[PDB]
Design a protein around this ligand. Structure first.
Ligand SMILES: [Ca+2]
Ligand SMILES: [Ca+2]
Ligand SMILES: [Co+2]
Lengths: 143, 143
C-alpha cells in the first residue's frame, strides 16, 4: 500500500531482467512485486535488489551478469507467497530509465513500461501507477 | 513442428489480445501457442482464431469486442495441456501487422514482436522464429 511520490528521468542506462517458469512476478527489496513477463523494454537498473532465498537481497545486475542460480519470491493468483527458481538471465542493454521514489522512501529505477503489481492484484506499468496515483502492492511477509 | 515460410507486411490494422491467470499462453487454430504475457505491441489481428472449449474456434476480435466469457487451452511448463478462462479482453488499437504464412498453410497475422512457443518450449517473437527458421510448437491433441 505505497504510492509513488516522484518520477525522475535518469537517461539511458544498462538494464536487466530475469525469467521464471511459474507466475511471472518476483519480489524486490521491501516487498514490491515486479513483472517477469516476456516484455520489452521492461527491465530494471543494475542496482535493483531482488530478494533471494539463498543470498538475501542481491542486485539484479549481479544476478544477471554472473548468471546466479537462485530462488525468488512470487505471488500466485490468490495472493499466496511462494518461491521459485530463476530460469532466465538477460542483459537488455541500454534503455531509458526512470527513477520512481515511493512514499515509503523506496526507490525503483526501471524502464517506465515496467509492470508492477498494484494493491488490487493487477499488473500495471509503473509510469501509469505514478500518474494515476495508485498504490503498489507491498508484501511485508518476506524474510 | 512447423516453420514459417513467408512474411508479409499488411500495414496498420486493429489488433487485440486477451489475458489469462495461469500460464501466459493459449492455443490458436491448428494448435499454435501464442503468448498472453503483458506485453506491447504484442497483439493479434481480428480474424485470428482462438480455440475455446465452449464455442470452438472464435476470432479474437469477436471475443474481445463482445467480451466473450470463454475457456482457452494452455500448456504448462511440463508440456501438459489444460484449460483456463479468459480473464482480460483488450482492443489494442491500430498496430503494425505482419502476415506469416506457415509451411502447413496456416496463417498468423500478428504484431511482429508477438511471442509464440517454439518446439523446445520457449517463447520467442514470431519475427525471430521466421528469420531464424525455427519450428513453432503445434499441439495436435486439441478438440
Ligand atoms: Ca524484458
Ligand atoms: Ca499486448
Ligand atoms: Co507473462
Amino acid at each position: 500500500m505505497v504510492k509513488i511520490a516522484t518520477r525522475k528521468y535518469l537517461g539511458k542506462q544498462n538494464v536487466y531482467d530475469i525469467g521464471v517458469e511459474r507466475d511471472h512476478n518476483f519480489a524486490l527489496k521491501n516487498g514490491f512485486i515486479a513483472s517477469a513477463c516476456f516484455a520489452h523494454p521492461q527491465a530494471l537498473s543494475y542496482e535493483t535488489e531482488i530478494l533471494t532465498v539463498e543470498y538475501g537481497l542481491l542486485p539484479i545486475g549481479k544476478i544477471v551478469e554472473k548468471r546466479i542460480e537462485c530462488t525468488v519470491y512470487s505471488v500466485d493468483n490468490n495472493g499466496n507467497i511462494y518461491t521459485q527458481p530463476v530460469a532466465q538471465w538477460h542483459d537488455r542493454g541500454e534503455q531509458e530509465v526512470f527513477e520512481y521514489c515511493l512514499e515509503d522512501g523506496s526507490l525503483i529505477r526501471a524502464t517506465k513500461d515496467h509492470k508492477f503489481m498494484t494493491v488490487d492484484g493487477q499488473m500495471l506499468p509503473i509510469d501509469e501507477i505514478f500518474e494515476r496515483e495508485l498504490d503498489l502492492m507491498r508484501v511485508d511477509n518476506l524474510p
